[PDB]
């Protein structure tokens, strides 16, 4: 498939934003950072796979053409919003449309790819999550999907 | 179970605003309650 040049230009602008060298190549860490910053959702397993593919060359830097190929390969995979809704419904044991904030925090902290608790507090503050009050999964999914 | 800790704490809450309805925080029942609250928090707290 061929990507629209407007999207390609936007991707290049995003790359240049964090490209502290300005050469069109940057470290794989900021590669994943801007990959997430694009709004797409790559698994950390997929992130490590992409990192090792780049490291096979040994450069450690993401050249813009290979970056565009990575963009296309990410465009190949596209999960649906209903899948996220069902995933959140799975954790909605009550099924009342609301989920507990503390238990969701524990789910985030101690399952699978564990992330920092400061990121959990970031979710709490940005999504105006009450510390103990029940939070609707659906509103969170909607304002998450708004992008 | 760690899952039931939230239920216990939520019930303790429900009782405490029940007390708020009668404005009996001065009575001291919460002081009888803290053993249960401490047990629930201990269960909820990570023990690694």
């Amino acid at each position: 498939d061929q990507l629209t040049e407007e999207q390609i230009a936007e991707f290049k602008e995003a790359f240049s934003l964090f490209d502290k060298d300005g050469d069109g190549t940057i470290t794989t860490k900021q590669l994943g950072t801007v990959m997430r910053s694009l709004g797409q959702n790559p698994t950390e397993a997929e992130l490590q796979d992409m990192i090792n593919e780049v490291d096979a060359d040994g450069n450690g830097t993401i050249d813009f053409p290979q970056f565009l190929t990575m963009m296309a390969r990410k465009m190949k995979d596209t999960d649906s919003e209903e899948e996220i809704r069902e995933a959140f419904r799975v954790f909605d044991k009550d099924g009342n449309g609301y989920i507990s904030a503390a238990q969701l925090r524990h789910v985030m902290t101690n399952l699978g790819e564990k992330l920092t608790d400061e990121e959990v507090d970031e979710m709490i503050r940005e999504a105006d999550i009450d510390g103990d009050g029940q939070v609707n999964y659906e509103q969170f999914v909607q304002m998450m999907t708004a992008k | 179970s760690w899952s039931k800790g939230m239920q216990i704490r939520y019930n303790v809450s429900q009782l405490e605003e029940w007390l708020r309805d009668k404005n009996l925080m001065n009575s001291g029942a919460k002081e009888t309650l803290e053993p249960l609250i401490q047990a629930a928090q201990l269960l909820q707290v990570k023990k690694k």
């Binding site: 009550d94 009342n96 507990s100 029940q134 | 039931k4 239920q7 216990i8 939520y10 019930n11």
Partner: peptide, 28 residues
């Protein structure tokens, strides 16, 4: 008398019942 009334009540109402946010619940 109050303890006698409440004795079978608590176990079912408090722990056995699953709160949703001979059968007794928190609201009971």
């Amino acid at each position: 008398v109050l303890e006698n009334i409440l004795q079978p009540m608590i176990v079912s109402g408090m722990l056995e019942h699953e709160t949703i946010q001979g059968t007794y619940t928190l609201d009971s």
